RNA sequence: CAACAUCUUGUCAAACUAUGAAUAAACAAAGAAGAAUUCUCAGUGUUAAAUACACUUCAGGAAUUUAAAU
RNA sequence: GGCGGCACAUCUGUUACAAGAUAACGCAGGUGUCCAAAGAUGAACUCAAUGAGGACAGAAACCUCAUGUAGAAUAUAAGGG
RNA sequence: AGGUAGAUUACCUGACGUUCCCAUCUGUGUGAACAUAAUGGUACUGAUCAGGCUCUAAGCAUCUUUACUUCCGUGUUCGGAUGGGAACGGGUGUAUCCUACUUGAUAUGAACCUACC
C-alpha cells in the first residue's frame, strides 16, 4: 500500500549528521564559540570558564580551558565530597551549592599561591551582600566567566549560587546581583537561602502538618538526626572547615567487559550457518 | 554580459560543500596565527560580514598584522602590467593555515638535527656527519640484474578486435 | 524485584477543546464552562487558514485545556460516565492515546440560562509510562525505545483493566 | 557604422614586453595599519633606546 | 480498473548535480641584506603573576661554527 | 537612416572557455522601492508535508501523538546563507 | 568500568531486535519557598521510597548509509603536432595527462584534560 517512506537510500546520501554533542544534546555550539573566542592578539593566553554542572546528585564545577586537543581542567571540586567538611545530606541545596563553588575557589588560590592575598569574605552576616574581588596591591584577582550550559537562567538558580561562592572566596567572576536567590528584598532573602534556610523552614512546616510526608521527604535527615535548627550552624561550620584545607584530600578500578567485537571468522560463519539452516529448513 | 556586482558569478564558488553546511570547526577560531605565518584565503559564504572579495579566494599571503579579531593578510595582486601589494583584515572564519612550507620546514629540522650532532661530534673530536643531499629531479636509474630464476614471462602481442555490441 | 513498576500506564496529559466558528460572546462563555470545569483558564485559540465556507485568520475560534495528574482521572470518569464506559475500538489511535465526544455538558443544569447555553465538548487522553520524559526534557533530549512506546492494544488492555469499560466493534 | 566592440587580442603579448613589475621589499615592510598595543611599546623602546644612546654620545 | 507504494528498464538538461579531469592560478624550495648554535639580555604590553608570550634593526652585546639548502 | 527598443546608471542565473578579464538590438528575469520594526540584544520554540485519533466537523475550522535535513520561512528578481 | 568538559564532525547517522548497572548517570517522589507556565508536562526548587523499563553505554545482522582499497579503465575526455585519410559530418596515427558512475573486498570509530570506581 501507500508508504512514501521518507527513510530510503535517497534520504540518507545527503543527510548532514549534527555535531557529535549537539547531536547527542549536551552542547551549544553557538554560543560556546562565544565562550571560547579568545582574542587574537593575545596568542595562547587562556581563557577560563567555571564549568557548573548540576546533576541529580551533584554539583560538578570545574575551570576549564580550551584548546584544539580538548578542553583542559584547571580545578575541580564536587559536592560529594562535602561530607569531608561535615554536610552529610542534601548535596544539591542552595546552601550545599554554595559550598562547592567557594571550596573550588580556595582550592584554586591554594594551587596558584595566592590564597593569602585574596581572602573574599569570611564572616556570615555579609553572606548575603554583593561582593567582587578587587584589586590587591596591584594584582588583579582570577578572572573567569562562567558557563552554565543547557540551564535556564532564573533569579532563584543555583548556578548563581556557585557563582556567588566563588566571588566570596577571592575568584573574580564578572556578573550582576540580579539573578541570585535576592534581587529582591534585601541580603537577609539571599543570607537566609545559602544558609539553609529554606530547607529549615519546610522540615518544622511538614513536621506540623504530617508526620508520613515529613518522614517522605526527609526520611534519611530524620535517621542522621540533623533537627530543622541544626543546618544553619552545619553551614556556617562547613564554610569555616574549607578556607582552612581545601587542597584536595586522601588501587586497582573492577572492569566489568560488556560483550567484545565478535572477528571476521566468528561473524562470517554466523551466516554459514544460518545459510546451512535455511536450506535444510526449506 | 555579466553585471558589476560584488558576488557576480557565485553559483558554485560559494556554495557549502556538500554535506559541509552549518557551523565550522572550532579548530577555524582556535588557531592561532603569528605576524609572518602563511595563510590561504578561503572565503566562508555563511559568515556574510566581512566577506573577502572574491577575487582573493585560494590566494595565498601572508599575515603582516594581528588584531583582537582580525587578522591582517599580504597578498599579490595583478594589475595591468605590474603586480601590486594588498593589504586586509580577514576573520579567521575565512582563512586557513597553509601548508605551503610543509615539506621545506621538515628538511629545515633535519639539517638542525645534524647541525646539533656535528657540534657535538666536533668537541668530541670525531668526524662530522655531512648534511643531507640535495633534492634532485627523477635521475636516470643505474644499471641493474635481474635473477631469472623467480622470473615470469608474458607474451605481448596486438590484440584481435572484438565488437563491443 | 521486578520491573514492571516502571512498565505502568498513567494518563499524563487531558486536554478539552470546545470549537465554536464565532469569535465573542459564544466563546467568551465557551471559555467559562471550562474554567468552571477544570479550575484553570483556557487558551483561546485563533484560526490558521481563512476559509469562507466556514466564515473564519487572526479571529479567535476555539478554546482548550489540558490538566493532569488527579484533576485529570476525575473529569476523565465523568466524561466516561456519561458515555457509559461505552467505547469503540476505532477510537484508540495507533499511538496508544483515544479520546471521544460529548454532546452536553453535565456541569451546572439548575441555573441554565440562556447565557450559559448548551456546548458539546470533546476529551481526548493521552497516556504515558514512567521515563517519558528523556523526549521532553531540555538537556540530552532522545527518543523512548519502541518497546517502552505504547501501542493500540496496550491503551485498550489499560482501558479495560482500570475501568472496566468494554470496546465494542460495530 | 557598427564598430567591433572589444578585443583581447595582442593584449598579453603588450604585457610581457615590459614584464609585470614586481613591488620592491620595501612594499611589504609598511606599518600603516598595525595593532595599536603593538605600535605604542615598539614606539616606547624605540623612544628609550633612542634616550639611552644619546645619552651616552653626549657623554662622550 | 485505475490510483498509490515498491523493484527494474530506455533516453536527456546552457539557465540540474553527488563525483570530477587535461590545460591553468597563486605559494614555498633560506635577503633587515648568506645560515646556525651558545651565553648574556633591556623597554613596553598581554598575564592571576610571570623567567611563558607579542613587538621592538629575530631591541641590543659577545663568542664558536658556517657559503648548505631542486 | 526613420518607426520600434534601451543592450545609456544599474543586479541575478546562463552564453563563458574549472585564476582574473570577458562580445552581440545573445537567452530567462530585475531596480529607481519597502521597514519604529522588517534595526539591536536576550530567552523559549521548530518549520512544509504525511499517517493515526477527537460531538456537530464533512476533502478544508480547532485539539493530540508519531515520522519529518528544511522539501517551510526569511519584504522583493535570481542565485547563495 | 562510569561521569564532566571537549577535538575530529555519520567509521559517530537511521531501522530491527539485545546486555549489565556494583559505583556513576538517568529515569524516580513532592510542591513550601526562589521561579514557572492554560497545565509542577517543560523550566524551578526540595528530596531518596522503589527500577534497570526507556535513556546512556557495549555489542548483533549476507542491514540501507557512510569511510579507505582494488576493479571499472588506460576505456571517457584532454594538452601538443602534418602539404595525414573524408564532399561533408566528423574521426586517425605520433610524443603525453588521465576522470567518473557502478561492482567486489574491508571497517562501523580513534583520540585529549579532570574526578570517582
Given at each position: ?39 587574537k ?42 561530607p ?12 550545599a551549592?554554595?559550598c ?25 552576616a ?19 566567566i ?46 537566609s ?26 526520611g ?17 561550620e ?9 587542597a ?15 572477528t571476521?571468522?566468528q561473524?562470517?560463519?554466523?551466516i ?9 529448513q526449506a | ?9 557565485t ?14 570547526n572550532?579548530s577555524?577560531?582556535?588557531?592561532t ?8 584565503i ?34 599579490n ?27 621545506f ?5 633535519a ?26 629531479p ?28 | 524485584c ?9 494518563i ?12 465573542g460572546?459564544?466563546l467568551?462563555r ?5 474554567e ?37 482521572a476525575?473529569?476523565?470518569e465523568?466524561?466516561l460516565?456519561?458515555k ?19 454532546e452536553?455538558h ?8 440562556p ?22 526534557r ?33 | 557604422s557598427?564598430?567591433?566592440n572589444?578585443?583581447?587580442?595582442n ?43 644619546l ?6
Amino acid at each position: 500500500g501507500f508508504l512514501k517512506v521518507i527513510k530510503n537510500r535517497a534520504y540518507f546520501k545527503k543527510y548532514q549528521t549534527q555535531f557529535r554533542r549537539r547531536r547527542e544534546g549536551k552542547t551549544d555550539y553557538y554560543a560556546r564559540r562565544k565562550m571560547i573566542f579568545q582574542d587574537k592578539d593575545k596568542f595562547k593566553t587562556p581563557k577560563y570558564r567555571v564549568v557548573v554542572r548540576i546533576t541529580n546528585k551533584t554539583v560538578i564545577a570545574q575551570i576549564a580551558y580550551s584548546e584544539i586537543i580538548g578542553d583542559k581542567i584547571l580545578c575541580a571540586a564536587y559536592s560529594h565530597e562535602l561530607p569531608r567538611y561535615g554536610v552529610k545530606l542534601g548535596l544539591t541545596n542552595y546552601a550545599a551549592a554554595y559550598c562547592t563553588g567557594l571550596l573550588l575557589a580556595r582550592r584554586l588560590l591554594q594551587k596558584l599561591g595566592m590564597d593569602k592575598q585574596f581572602v573574599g569574605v569570611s564572616d556570615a552576616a555579609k553572606l548575603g551582600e554583593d561582593y567582587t574581588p578587587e584589586e590587591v596591591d596591584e594584582r588583579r584577582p582570577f578572572k573567569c566567566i562562567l558557563d552554565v550550559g543547557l540551564a535556564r537562567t532564573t533569579t532563584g538558580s543555583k548556578v548563581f549560587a556557585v557563582l556567588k561562592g566563588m566571588c566570596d572566596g577571592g575568584v573574580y567572576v564578572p556578573h550582576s546581583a540580579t539573578r541570585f536567590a535576592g534581587a529582591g528584598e534585601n541580603e537577609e532573602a539571599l543570607r537566609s537561602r545559602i544558609l539553609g534556610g529554606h530547607v529549615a523552614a519546610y522540615m518544622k512546616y511538614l513536621s506540623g502538618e504530617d508526620a508520613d510526608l515529613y518522614k517522605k521527604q526527609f526520611g534519611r535527615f530524620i535517621a542522621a538526626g540533623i533537627a530543622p535548627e541544626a543546618l544553619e550552624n552545619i553551614y556556617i561550620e562547613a564554610h569555616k572547615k574549607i578556607r582552612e584545607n581545601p587542597a584536595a584530600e586522601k588501587k586497582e578500578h573492577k572492569k566489568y567487559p560488556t560483550s567484545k567485537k565478535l572477528t571476521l571468522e566468528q561473524r562470517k560463519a554466523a551466516i554459514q550457518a544460518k545459510l546451512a539452516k535455511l536450506a535444510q529448513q526449506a | 554580459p555579466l553585471s558589476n556586482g560584488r558576488n557576480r558569478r557565485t553559483r558554485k564558488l560559494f556554495k557549502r560543500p556538500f554535506r559541509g553546511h552549518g557551523l565550522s570547526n572550532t579548530s577555524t577560531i582556535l588557531h592561532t596565527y603569528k605576524v609572518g605565518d602563511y595563510v590561504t584565503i578561503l572565503c566562508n559564504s555563511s559568515i556574510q560580514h566581512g566577506l573577502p572579495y572574491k577575487a582573493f579566494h585560494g590566494k595565498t599571503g601572508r599575515v603582516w598584522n594581528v588584531n583582537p579579531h582580525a587578522i591582517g593578510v599580504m597578498v599579490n595582486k595583478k594589475v595591468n602590467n605590474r603586480i601590486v601589494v594588498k593589504r586586509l583584515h580577514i576573520s579567521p572564519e575565512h582563512i586557513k593555515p597553509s601548508g605551503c612550507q610543509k615539506d621545506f620546514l621538515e628538511r629545515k629540522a633535519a639539517v638542525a638535527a645534524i647541525r646539533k650532532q656535528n657540534i657535538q661530534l666536533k668537541k668530541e673530536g670525531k668526524p662530522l656527519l655531512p648534511l643531507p643531499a640535495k633534492r634532485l629531479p627523477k635521475q636516470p636509474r643505474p644499471a641493474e640484474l635481474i635473477k631469472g630464476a623467480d622470473i615470469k614471462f608474458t607474451t605481448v602481442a596486438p590484440l584481435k578486435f572484438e565488437e563491443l555490441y | 524485584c521486578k520491573s514492571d513498576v516502571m512498565r505502568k500506564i498513567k494518563i499524563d496529559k487531558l486536554v478539552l477543546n470546545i470549537s465554536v466558528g464565532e469569535s465573542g460572546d459564544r466563546l467568551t462563555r465557551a471559555a467559562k464552562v471550562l474554567e468552571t470545569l477544570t479550575g484553570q483558564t483556557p487558551v483561546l485559540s485563533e484560526a490558521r487558514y481563512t476559509v469562507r465556507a466556514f466564515s473564519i485568520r487572526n479571529d479567535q475560534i476555539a478554546c482548550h485545556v489540558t490538566v493532569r495528574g488527579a484533576k485529570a482521572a476525575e473529569i476523565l470518569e465523568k466524561g466516561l460516565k456519561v458515555k457509559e464506559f461505552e467505547l469503540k475500538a476505532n477510537n484508540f489511535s495507533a499511538t496508544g492515546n483515544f479520546g471521544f465526544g460529548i454532546e452536553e455538558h453535565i456541569d451546572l443544569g439548575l441555573k441554565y440560562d440562556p447565557q450559559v447555553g448548551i456546548y458539546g465538548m470533546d476529551f481526548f487522553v493521552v497516556l504515558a509510562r514512567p521515563g517519558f520524559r528523556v523526549s521532553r526534557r531540555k538537556r540530552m533530549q532522545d527518543k523512548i525505545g519502541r518497546d517502552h512506546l505504547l501501542t493500540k492494544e496496550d491503551a485498550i488492555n489499560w482501558f479495560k483493566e482500570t475501568y472496566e469499560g468494554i470496546v465494542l466493534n460495530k | 557604422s557598427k564598430d567591433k566592440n572589444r578585443s583581447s587580442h595582442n593584449q598579453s603579448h603588450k604585457a610581457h614586453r615590459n614584464g609585470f613589475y614586481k613591488p620592491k621589499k620595501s612594499a611589504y615592510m609598511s606599518t600603516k595599519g598595525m595593532n595599536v598595543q603593538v605600535l605604542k611599546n615598539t614606539k616606547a623602546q624605540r623612544k628609550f633606546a633612542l634616550a639611552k644612546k644619546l645619552e651616552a654620545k653626549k657623554a662622550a
